[PDB]
């Protein structure tokens, strides 16, 4: 049931000037679309969605965790912290930091939560605990986005991203209340309107998390999509390019998502 219908991914990545990796799953029939799906690509900020899921998992054993108030100093505010900078003088709860990390890609919020979990190795350990043997987070923020060609640090594959996303949003990796909270945070994302969402009709529900490293044409998005009248679709779209100053493209990500839905026979 893999690639029952071929799609012109190769022409798309050649026009872009780099590499595109796609893995999309129809959770009803099990049919898939797969292109460079087992290659490694930089996660960039997309790790923050899995970070929030790891916080929710811990909250199953710590009933007070989500409402715990976290204060922080000005030294915590790194570039692109649009929510946490408004609460510097007050603090924010763990749940609020998680929402900001998912929905605004807030960097200070993600760093505080990574600390709570035991750093890059702690997030990696959570991913191992749901059966993902590909994901690796290795560095703390900023340098984790270097996107160096051939460097496996801070990478995963489109396939492992999609499989883990399915387990957390639709499967049994989280308890039911935590599962729906993760879905609700993804549905509220504000940074993805020109990526997978641009390929999804307005009357379908959708949640996603983006990544944009800023170098090497490297950017990405993953999403769960609920077309009406059929089972949900889970997909991941990752890009990279050979030269440090190659630009990323949101349009290429949206176009790749459209080809994935077409390959699955989902009318959009």
Q: Do residues 186 and 49 touch, judged by C-beta distance below 8 A?
A: yes
Question: Which of 34, 45, 164, 249 is an active site residue?
Answer: 45
149: number of Cβ within 10 Å: 12
81 catalytically annotated: no
At closest approach, how far in Å is the CB of 146 from ligand ID1? 10
For residues 161 and 213, which CB has a smaller minimum distance to ligand ID1 in the complex?
213
Dihedral (CA of 176, 161, 42, 15) sign:
negative
48 a known binding residue? yes
129 catalytically annotated: no
Token representation of residue 262? 């077409």
144: number of Cβ within 10 Å: 21
For residues 250 and 262, which CB has a smaller minimum distance to ligand ID1 in the complex?
250
Count of residues near ligand ID1 by CB under 6 A: 12
228 a known binding residue? no
189 binds ligand ID1 (CB under 6 A): no
At closest approach, how far in Å is the CB of 52 from ligand ID1? 14
At closest approach, how far in Å is the CB of 142 from ligand ID1? 7
Token representation of residue 85? 């900078």
List binders of ligand ID1 among 138-167 (CB under 6 A). 145
Transcribe 54-65 into DSSP letters.
HHHHHHTT-TTS
Among 44, 53, 130, 235, binds ligand ID1 (CB under 6 A): 44
Among 84, 98, 107, 164, binds ligand ID1 (CB under 6 A): 107
Query: What is the 3-state composition of the chain as percent helix, strand, coil, each rounded to the nearest 5?
Result: 40, 15, 45
191 binds ligand ID1 (CB under 6 A): yes
For residues 158 and 263, which CB has a smaller minimum distance to ligand ID1 in the complex?
158
102 binds ligand ID1 (CB under 6 A): no
Residue nearest to ligand ID1 (CB): 45
Q: How far is CA 33 from the centre of its chain?
A: 18
45 a known binding residue? yes
75 a known binding residue? no
β-partners of residue 20 are: 239
* DSSP designation for 251: H
80 binds ligand ID1 (CB under 6 A): yes
Among 84, 105, 164, 181, binds ligand ID1 (CB under 6 A): 105
Helical packing angle, 119-129 and 47-59, nearest 10°: 70
List binders of ligand ID1 among 206-225 (CB under 6 A). 210-214
For residue 48, with 0-12 CB atoms within 10 Å meaning exposed, 13-18 middle and 19 or more buried, which class applies? buried
Q: Collapsing DSSP states into helix, strand and coil, what is residue 234?
A: strand
Catalytic residues: 45, 143
The residue ranges that bind ligand ID1 (CB under 6 A) are 44-45, 80, 105, 107, 145, 191, 210-214
């Amino acid at each position: 049931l893999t690639n029952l219908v071929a799609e012109p991914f190769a022409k798309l990545e050649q026009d872009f000037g780099g590499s595109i990796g796609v893995y999309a799953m129809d959770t009803g029939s099990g049919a898939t679309v797969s292109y460079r799906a087992e290659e490694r690509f930089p996660l960039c900020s997309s790790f923050k969605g899995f970070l929030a899921a790891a916080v929710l998992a811990r909250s199953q054993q710590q009933a007070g965790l989500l409402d715990t108030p976290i204060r922080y100093g000005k030294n915590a505010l790194v570039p692109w912290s649009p929510i946490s900078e408004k609460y510097l003088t007050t603090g924010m709860t763990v749940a609020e930091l998680s929402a900001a990390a998912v929905q605004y890609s807030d960097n200070a919020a993600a760093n505080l939560l990574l600390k709570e979990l035991g750093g890059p190795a702690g997030l990696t350990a959570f991913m191992r605990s749901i059966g993902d043997t590909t994901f690796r987070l290795d560095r703390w923020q900023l340098e984790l986005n270097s996107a160096i060609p051939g460097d496996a640090r801070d990478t995963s594959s489109p396939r492992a991203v999609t499989e883990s996303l399915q387990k957390l949003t639709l499967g049994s990796a989280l308890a039911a209340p935590q599962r729906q909270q993760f879905v609700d945070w993804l549905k509220g994302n504000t940074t993805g309107n020109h990526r997978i969402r641009a390929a999804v009709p307005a009357d379908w529900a959708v949640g996603d998390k983006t990544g944009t490293c800023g170098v090497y044409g490297t950017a990405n998005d993953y999403a769960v999509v609920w077309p009406t009248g059929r089972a949900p679709i889970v997909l991941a779209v990752y890009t990279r390019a050979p030269n440090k100053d190659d630009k990323h493209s949101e349009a290429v990500i949206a176009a790749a998502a459209r080809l994935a839905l077409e390959g699955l026979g989902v009318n959009g």
